[PDB]
């Protein structure tokens, strides 16, 4: 059950589910595991918001353990394509692809809540079959790994070498550490 | 699914219905009869609204059932409107096939999307005679798919055949060079 709320407008009174109500303020939620359908929904919301106002910032509130890379990249490419800056906020956690989309936010507009945490690592995969096919899929995931590291470097300011070193295994970052690493810009203070 | 308001007076829509109003259709996830028929219905509806305006098919799919995908393919080629295609995330197998099936010059990859192509997958169990029937059929399907891929990509038939015997990945730039997509969608 998603709560309903009322918005007072000169056109009259309107009822919205609470997420639709926040969408009206250009706030989009990325919640739980990243996968095709939740990701596509985020893409649609971003395209819709750009159409509404191409100049106004959009906000992406992230609480996610990560998920499917290709699904995540549909969001990433949408973020970079649209005219509005996409400001990102980490609530609770942003791990794996979650952390990637967090750092993909507009420079200067990426935030961590004080007690949220981040985790970064390398792509995980799996294939079964003929050696010939294993090689094909192995090569591909290595290419994916390379691309993801390049993009992480671009957004954090870290060198490719450093990113590679830091993502070979699970690496946790506190909010302050995320700021220091160039992964977000600041901690949301009050 | 979030709801939104369009001023027309003003009314309400779920977000996908809102984008459909702008002639945008989403092809998301597994390709199969039900999601495919829904897409066909949307295409027919859009054509009926305006037979000459472009339609947009946003693809993020690992592919799926061939016949289901071919219902979409044939609808795309039948309707008068150009169907512009955009690959976001991935377009693999039947997904890649439908991506390349878009109107010439209006097929796009997002910068970090990827494509994968390969030959038909199938399986049958029973008498040798029936095995022959179904093997023969999937080979004919394979032939048609390769011919259509050649047509849309501009690659020679023999080259398509070689490239699809096993899984082949194509980055966005590689998809452009391959003639599977026309260009990369940049800001």
């Amino acid at each position: 059950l998603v709560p309903m709320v009322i918005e007072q407008t000169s056109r009259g009174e309107r009822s919205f589910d609470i997420y639709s109500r926040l969408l009206k303020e250009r706030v989009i939620f990325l919640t739980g595991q990243v996968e095709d359908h939740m990701a596509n929904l985020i893409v649609a919301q971003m395209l819709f918001l750009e159409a509404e106002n191409p100049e106004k910032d959009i906000y992406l509130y992230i609480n996610s353990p990560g998920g499917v890379i290709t699904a995540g990249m549909s969001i990433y490419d949408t973020m970079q394509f649209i005219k509005p800056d996409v400001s990102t906020i980490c609530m609770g956690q942003a791990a794996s692809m979650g952390a990637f989309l967090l750092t993909a936010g507009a420079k200067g507009k990426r935030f961590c809540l004080p007690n949220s945490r981040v985790m970064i690592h390398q792509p995980l995969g799996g294939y079964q079959g003929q050696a010939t096919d294993i090689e094909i899929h192995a090569r591909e995931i290595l290419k994916v790994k390379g691309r993801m590291n390049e993009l992480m470097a671009l957004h954090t300011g870290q060198s490719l070498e450093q990113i590679e070193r830091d993502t070979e295994r699970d690496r946790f970052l506190s909010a302050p550490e995320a700021v220091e690493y160039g992964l977000v810009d600041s901690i949301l203070t009050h | 699914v979030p709801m939104v308001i369009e001023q027309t007076g003003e009314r309400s829509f779920d977000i996908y219905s809102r984008l459909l109003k702008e002639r945008v259709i989403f092809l998301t996830g597994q390709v199969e009869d039900h999601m495919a028929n829904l897409i066909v219905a949307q295409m027919l509806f859009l054509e009926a609204e305006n037979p000459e305006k472009d339609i947009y098919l946003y693809i993020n799919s690992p592919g799926g059932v061939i016949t289901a995908g071919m219902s979409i393919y044939d609808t795309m080629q039948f309707i008068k409107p150009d169907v512009s295609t955009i690959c976001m995330g991935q377009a693999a197998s039947m997904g890649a096939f439908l991506l390349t099936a878009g109107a010439k010059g209006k097929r796009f990859c997002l910068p970090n999307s990827r494509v994968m192509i390969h030959q038909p997958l199938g399986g049958y169990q029973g008498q040798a005679t029936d095995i022959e029937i179904h093997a023969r059929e999937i080979l004919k399907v394979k032939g048609r798919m390769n011919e259509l891929m050649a047509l849309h990509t501009g690659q020679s038939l023999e080259q398509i055949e070689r490239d699809t015997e096993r899984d082949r990945f194509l980055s966005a730039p590689e998809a452009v060079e391959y003639g599977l997509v026309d260009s990369i969608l940049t800001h």
Binding site: - | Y56, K106, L185
Partner: peptide
Amino acid sequence: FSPAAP
């Protein structure tokens, strides 16, 4: 997706 897909 506008500029041109729409």
